[PDB]
């Protein structure tokens, strides 16, 4: 693909296929969503659904800039939503235009959440919280599998994060199954980092989240309760998501214990696939087996039975846990970025990456053939001063 299969405008007519109104397992009124790629949807709305304790837009004891930022007005008009949509699109293309990004995005599309939502162990059933309900011409809904949703932030505009629906009796993000990932994110804000003169490239910030989603989609995310003292406690999951310099803070023994752990979980999945006798939905047990064979890179014998290939597993696992990292993306983008995760944002800026004179798929802010080309001038909020508005 050119990755994104078309230039959506927010006002484009619904077609029930890649532009439609949907519900996200909550009752909520439908919202307009856009499938920008197989398995990948964008909902240009403030996220007031995915959390019951988060259905409003600033709380009494709210933190200040540049930790949090509030504006209940943001993303409330069609112009804003159209802009949000086109911004997110641009960043996907920018990420995809790199070899690293191309791979991460491919692993994500392949990373279909396992069909382990059945009581019978020989039955393959999709978990409903891994689908969205898509409105059809008669007002009936059809359930559709998806891997990733990009959605507007909740009350706190810069609280970017991966969220997913849970299970009464399964730890989807940690058992090798994976679940559909909802990424609260905005293309219209970024951060000044130490030292905050220089602005973070929004493409890096999205990639960061895409890497979390990668982990979660393959059920290999690490419990946020697992932390490492750094001086301060940071979660294993974040340190490894950033990578680079921060790798030093990660206990290699635990690192290896998780690896063996998840190899086993993949065996469980292989074993389950072998025991499967029925499926729910419309193709196909055999087809879903192939789907998951590809996701977990399982080896298939002549009798069609599946098993985990140690080599293929080690490569897959390494790819997801220490090749897809923020630090590595920085290298590919050749932008300026914090060299560690433990770096405080010193400011927040409103931006607009949609105009091609502002930001390109190829150079981000540091446009070639402009004064902004050299020394990361484009990321210098004092030099490229018409592209950034410092907040409060």
């Amino acid at each position: 693909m050119p990755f994104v299969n078309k230039q959506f405008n927010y006002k484009d007519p619904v077609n029930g296929v890649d532009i439609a109104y949907i519900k996200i397992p909550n009752q909520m009124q439908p919202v307009k969503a856009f499938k920008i790629h197989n398995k990948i949807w964008v909902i240009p709305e403030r996220d007031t659904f995915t959390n019951p304790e988060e259905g409003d837009l600033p709380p009494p004891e709210a933190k200040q800039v540049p930790v949090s930022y509030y504006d209940s007005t943001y993303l409330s008009t069609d112009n804003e939503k159209d802009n949000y949509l086109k911004g997110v699109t641009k960043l996907f293309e920018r990420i995809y235009s790199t070899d690293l990004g191309r791979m991460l995005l491919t692993s994500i599309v392949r990373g279909i959440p396992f069909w382990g939502g059945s009581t019978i162990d020989t039955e393959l059933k999709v978990i409903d919280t891994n689908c969205i309900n898509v409105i059809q011409p008669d007002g009936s809904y059809r359930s559709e599998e998806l891997n990733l949703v990009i959605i507007g932030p909740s009350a706190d505009i810069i609280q970017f994060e991966c969220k997913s629906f849970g299970h009464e009796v399964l730890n989807l993000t940690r058992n090798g199954y994976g679940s559909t990932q909802y990424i609260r994110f905005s293309p219209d804000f970024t951060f000044g980092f130490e030292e905050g003169k220089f602005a973070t490239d929004p493409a890096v910030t999205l990639a960061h989240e895409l890497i979390h989603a990668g982990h979660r989609l393959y059920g290999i995310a690490i419990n946020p309760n697992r932390v490492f003292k750094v001086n301060l406690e940071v979660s294993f999951e974040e340190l490894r998501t950033f990578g680079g310099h921060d790798a030093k803070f990660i206990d290699s023994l635990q690192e290896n214990e998780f690896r063996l752990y998840y190899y086993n979980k993949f065996k469980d999945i292989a074993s389950t696939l072998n025991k499967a006798k029925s499926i729910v939905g419309t193709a196909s047990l055999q087809y879903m087996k192939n789907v998951f064979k590809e996701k977990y890179l399982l080896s298939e014998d002549t009798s069609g039975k599946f098993s985990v290939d140690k080599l293929k597993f080690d490569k897959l696992y390494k790819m997801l846990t220490e090749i897809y990292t923020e630090d590595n993306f920085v290298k590919f983008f050749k932008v300026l970025n914090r060299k560690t995760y433990l770096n405080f944002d010193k400011a927040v800026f409103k931006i607009n990456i949609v105009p091609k004179v502002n930001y390109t798929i190829y150079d981000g802010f540091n446009l070639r053939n402009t004064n902004l080309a050299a020394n990361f001038n484009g990321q210098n909020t004092e030099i490229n001063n018409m592209n950034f508005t410092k907040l409060k």
Partner: peptide, 7 residues
């Protein structure tokens, strides 16, 4: 999540 969320 941004580093801010560890605090």
């Amino acid at each position: 999540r941004r580093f801010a969320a560890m605090l």
